[PDB]
């Protein structure tokens, strides 16, 4: 259960810029809400088209598609803005979970103390609105809380993305991750080399991350690719995912070391679409969730470096941004150009 | 003609000074795409392969090519259909080698039942064989009629799953040369004429009966009768975007008591839509999607024409075709290069 979408504030914003037709994109868990919002803005004299693709991040705005079908603006549900040039005015509408993080923290104080006195705290967008309460609670328990601002791919200090842990690159004896799943906590452990404790707000369960098994299974994938002679280097056209210079460099690099290499252009990166190609191994240079989370070895740019022996220590693939001036609001936002 | 003219392609590329090209390919030519790329790269042209699986010239990857800085696009497996293109595009049609005459001779007794004046049609892969099929049928006493088709078609006599314009000519019965049932079925429902399909490989013939198919559609329409919320889908694929027609359908459903929302997609498939509240869908893009579903759609999915029947505006069934305008010329039987 999440907090309700700010229909009124949204409508007001569209009217402010004067918008007659808008495209609404939404993530898996907000399909029913996207239609409610559409039926609402329509009764208010605004033509609405729903984006039928399932959105997975602000790194993939449907501004191009909006343009193509004549929409004045774009409404992006469920995610906050990340620095990207946009072709049509876009209103981001973050989703905030109501579950209490503090309750999950109080249940696990003992485990958190094992982390250290000065600790780095991180969380995902859905709990970012409760980060301040979590910080004050931890401080009242004797911790010094270090929260990093992060870079331009990030919306709020302390927020991590599966492909970006810049807010965690600060000083601390250990890292506390507030949220569910193991992908974020795992990336944090690999990216920072510090001990990580993950606490799931819903179940209140805790997990001490051990990257070992993960790194092992990845090396096994690297080993298999060591025998390959033919590689496919994949990029995605999604605005916040396109890493062409980096892909072109991996191609040049595989060739230098006696491998055949081909740059492959896609939108959604699905191994399923590549089964008929002759490549023996693949390198995905886009969202790292793809290779890190395939009948043939699929790797990240970092792993291909390791495979070619040009890198020794295992590293998590990240999409970094440059410095960020301000922070996004804890509510909707409008962005243009 | 039955091979990728690597050298003819390099020539046309060197001629326009292309340095970086994107190559798209259908499922059956994935390995050919990479061999062509290897060949072009040995000749000073950077090559990128489009990773998506292509299903027709109705889905050119010129925009994507533009997005990654390619100065040209190579479209393998299909011939050109009229559409604006953002970069010079070379179309490399696939031509099957099989000679079709033997299979016609074998079934000459069945072809006779179509009548004296017959309409002859085939798909892209056997198009170069139409001249021979014509000479044979004429040498057997038939009067062969071959329609030019519209701008969505590349050569006279060619049908597409969504376009049977070449068959809208004077003629008693229709002969279809090819394998598979989708095309012959589309012909029968689109022209409401008698269709005889002959497979050039097996020499097997088939008199087409749309009855089964039509009943199945009525059924589907029935299942949507008690639906109130409708999703009306369009695809942003260049040769498939039918925005005006989709909007019209949204307006029509609303005027008739139903709720309807226009949905924009690229690849149209049910899974992406499962989370939406809509009870029924209307696909206003490629007709093969709703008319040839193997079972991926868990909710009733219809074509624009079927909606009109459901709403009670149309009485007889009609095939959802994507029509083009007059075509001034015909594409070559080999590669072609276009730039709009
Ligand atoms: S690149 Fe991948 S991890 Fe990063 S925001 Fe997009 S979908 Fe999420
Ligand atoms: S039948 Fe569908 S995929 Fe084939 S050419 Fe027509 S629109 Fe394109």
From Swiss-Prot, chain A:
Highest rank taxon of the organism: Archaea
Record-given protein name: 2-(3-amino-3-carboxypropyl)histidine synthase
Signal peptide: none
Impact when changing residue 59 to A: Still able to bind a 4Fe-4S cluster. Less active than wild-type. Not able to bind a 4Fe-4S cluster and loss of catalytic activity
Variant or mutagenesis effect after changing residue 287 to A: Still able to bind a 4Fe-4S cluster. Less active than wild-type. Not able to bind a 4Fe-4S cluster and loss of catalytic activity
GO MF, one annotated term: 4 iron, 4 sulfur cluster binding
Cofactor(s) recorded in Swiss-Prot or TrEMBL: [4Fe-4S] cluster
PANTHER family assigned to the protein according to its UniProt record, in alphabetical order: 2-(3-AMINO-3-CARBOXYPROPYL)HISTIDINE SYNTHASE SUBUNIT 1, DIPHTHAMIDE BIOSYNTHESIS PROTEIN
Cofactor annotation remark: Binds 1 [4Fe-4S] cluster per subunit. The cluster is coordinated with 3 cysteines and an exchangeable S-adenosyl-L-methionine.
Chain sites annotated for binding [4Fe-4S] cluster: 59, 163, 287
Subunit structure as annotated in this protein's UniProt entry: Homodimer.
Matches recorded under InterPro entries: DPH1/DPH2, DPH1/DPH2_1, DPH1/DPH2_2, DPH1/DPH2_3, DPH1/DPH2_euk_archaea, Dph2_arc
EC number: 2.5.1.108
Family designation: Belongs to the DPH1/DPH2 family.
Role played: Catalyzes the first step of diphthamide biosynthesis, i.e. the transfer of the 3-amino-3-carboxypropyl group from S-adenosyl-L-methionine (SAM) to the C2 position of the imidazole ring of the target histidine residue in translation elongation factor 2 (EF-2).
Keywords: 4Fe-4S, Iron, Iron-sulfur, Metal-binding, S-adenosyl-L-methionine, Transferase
Miscellaneous information on this protein: Unlike the enzymes in the radical SAM superfamily, Dph2 does not form the canonical 5'-deoxyadenosyl radical. Instead, it breaks the C(gamma)-S bond of SAM and generates a 3-amino-3-carboxypropyl radical intermediate. Thus, the P.horikoshii Dph2 represents a previously unknown, SAM-dependent, [4Fe-4S]-containing enzyme that catalyzes unprecedented chemistry. Moreover, the chemistry requires only one [4Fe-4S] cluster to be present in the Dph2 dimer, although each monomer can bind a [4Fe-4S] cluster.
Pathway involvement of the protein, from the record: Protein modification; peptidyl-diphthamide biosynthesis
Enzyme kind, highest EC tier: transferase
One of the protein's GO biological processes: S-adenosylmethionine catabolic process
Pfam family, one: Diphthamide_syn
